[PDB]
Structure 1
Amino acid sequence: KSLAKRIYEAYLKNFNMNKVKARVILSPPFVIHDMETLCMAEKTLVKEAEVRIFHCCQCTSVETVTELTEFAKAIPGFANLDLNDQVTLLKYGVYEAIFAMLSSVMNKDGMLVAYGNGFITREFLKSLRKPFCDIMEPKFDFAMKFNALELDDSDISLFVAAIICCGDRPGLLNVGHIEKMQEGIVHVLRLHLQSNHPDDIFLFPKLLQKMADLRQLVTEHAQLVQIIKKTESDAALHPLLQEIYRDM
């Protein structure tokens, strides 16, 4: 199906980091396993260590939104939608996509950061004071079960495309058409999963469960976000991310 080929190529063009790239790397990355190694990484690769780390998260968040936006625009049909719908889908979709794609750079030990040249451990993140330690853990939890599906980039591209073109985001104008868009993408995905993962012909419905879990993961994230907004002064939230979260 040509739709699979376009989305995949759009995803390779638009996402600087992808799974095969991240796996080749994890197969020489710098390891932030402690403060001493944190500071060293802040010398080369990119105020409390905690809020520093947080700020780095926001930077990465913003870059990925930009890339998701550009990826969206390259999805057949997307640019032909009304603007308020292009905005709506992105608004409600970026964080599900972000956390789905975050899985590609996480193993049980930690996650790649600084465009791949850094690696921050899961443990070191958990050692952090509250609530900042509660930020990455649920994402690591999601990632482990997600990576267990062993999707590749050709799968993930379609999965992210489906997250984005989602007929049930609140406030859509042309729902009928967006439903059909999603149907077409979901269709490509299912068949693609059937040819690319014959060993689990029910991998498709499992990914639908993943979608549900992403919606719940993100909801919980926004709450922790709202907590950190009200706890820590010195942890300012980037106005772009703040706009994304507004009335979400």
Structure 2
Amino acid sequence: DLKAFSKHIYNAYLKNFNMTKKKARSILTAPFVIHDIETLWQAEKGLVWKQLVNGLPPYKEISVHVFYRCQCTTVETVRELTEFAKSIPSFSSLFLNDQVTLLKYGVHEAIFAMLASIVNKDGLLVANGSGFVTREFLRSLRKPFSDIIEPKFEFAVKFNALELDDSDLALFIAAIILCGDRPGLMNVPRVEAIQDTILRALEFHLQANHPDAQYLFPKLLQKMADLRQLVTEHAQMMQRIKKTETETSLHPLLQEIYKD
């Protein structure tokens, strides 16, 4: 019963996401390194990006350009997370408006967790694993763009120290999205009941896949709390960019996510 619930979620994870954590870490341990303006120009003229540079909004400056590449990945990851959730029968049985509520308030927590896999202390992978942007370069961008990036590195390296595999992540992501505390949810008891079953699946999976791990499941529940604070800080910083970087465009889907 529950063993099949989990594997249904695991198959949805493998089907709807392109790069696994296993692949990400193997690459991280070669990609073209982006560490300065010159290598960023070469990467944009040399590497193959999911989003064609010509499709981005008009050029404004280096910091803004990186910010647009950031939006490309988060919007692409929202797309995959939406198909991942829709491949979960219990998620698809909710009314469409509750599905949107859960994605609206959940995808960024999910993004900052799942994409921790492509990050290490030195930087993170870009361009489908073909590039590697250095943390030092991202820190050298001008405020406020350097400010929004650093907190995610601190989380990702502490998160990666838990050594979750893709099977753990699949359940963990499902649990983030199916969260009963999201504002404006219609059928709270149903979402709460689904989240509880996912968490029960998570614990059963962990104690089998990580029999010698100490306190791993409560450690992950604390990371769910951390992610909420991370996203809260992120949304505050995004509202400051909207306010004072009027020249910077925001993808319409993210405008809808941050509309409040």
| Equivalent in 68, 90, 114 of residue 77 of structure 1 | 90
SS at structure 2 position matched to 1:149 = coil
Alignment partner of 1:107 out of 104, 115, 120: 120
Aligned twin of 1:157: 170
In structure 2, the partner of 1:123 is 136
Please give the per-residue CA displacement for 1:36-74, whole angstroms capped at 9, x wherever unaligned: 111000102243111100000111111000000000001
Shift of 1:208: 0.5
Structure 2 counterpart SS, 1:77: helix
Structure 1: how far apart are the matches of 2:257 and 2:116?
21
Letter in 2 for 1:62: V
Distance in 2, Cα, partners of 1:131 & 1:172: 32
Once the two structures are TM-superposed, the CA of residue 197 in structure 1 deviates from its matched residue by 1.4
1:51–1:234: 8 Å Cα contact kept in structure 2?
A: no
User: What fraction of aligned residue pairs are identical, expressed as a percent?
Assistant: 72
SS at structure 2 position matched to 1:24: helix
Q: Distance in 2 between matches of 1:234 and 1:198?
A: 52
Q: How far 1:124 sits from its partner (Å)?
A: 0.7
Q: How does 1:12-27 map to 2 (within 5 A)?
A: 12-27=14-29
2:209 aligned partner, one-letter code: N
1:3 and 1:76 in contact (8 A); partners too:
no
Query: What does 1:43-62 correspond to in 2, within 5 Å?
Result: 43-45=45-47, 46=49, 47-62=60-75
For 2:138 and 2:19, locate their aligned partners in 1 and report how far apart those are by CA, in whole Å.
Answer: 21
The residue type equivalent to 1:142 in the other structure is F
TM-score using structure 2 length: 0.92
Over the residues paired in the alignment, what is the CA RMSD in angstroms? 1.0
Which of 64, 77, 81 is equivalent to 1:64? 77
Report what 1:29 is aligned to: 31
Contact 1:105/1:112, CA 8 A, preserved across alignment: yes
Worse overlay, 197-206 or 98-107: 197-206
**CA displacement 1:99-147 (0-9 Å, x = unmatched):** 0012000000000011111110011100111111112110000001100
Provide the secondary structure at the position in 1 that maps to 2:183.
coil
- Is 1:196 matched with 2:209? yes
Q: Secondary structure at the match of 1:111?
A: strand
| Deviation digits for residues 159-186 of structure 1 (CA, Å, limit 9, x no counterpart) | 0000001111111111111111111100
Q: Which runs of 4+ in 1 moved over 3 A?
A: none
Q: TM-score by structure 1 length?
A: 0.97
How far residue 27 of structure 1 moved from its aligned partner, in angstroms, is 2.5
Aligned residues: 247
In the TM superposition, residue 4 of structure 1 has moved relative to its aligned partner by: 1.3
Hey, what's the Cα distance between the residues in 2 that align with 1:213 and 1:89?
A: 18
Output the amino acid matched with 1:14.
Answer: N
| Shift of residue 24, structure 1, vs aligned partner | 1.8
Letter in structure 1 aligned against 2:149: M
Q: What secondary structure is seen at the aligned counterpart in 1 of 2:213?
A: coil
Matched, 1:87 2:100: yes
Aligned residue type for 2:191: I
Find the counterpart in structure 2 of residue 219 from structure 1. Answer: 232
* Equivalent residue number for residue 141 of structure 1: 154
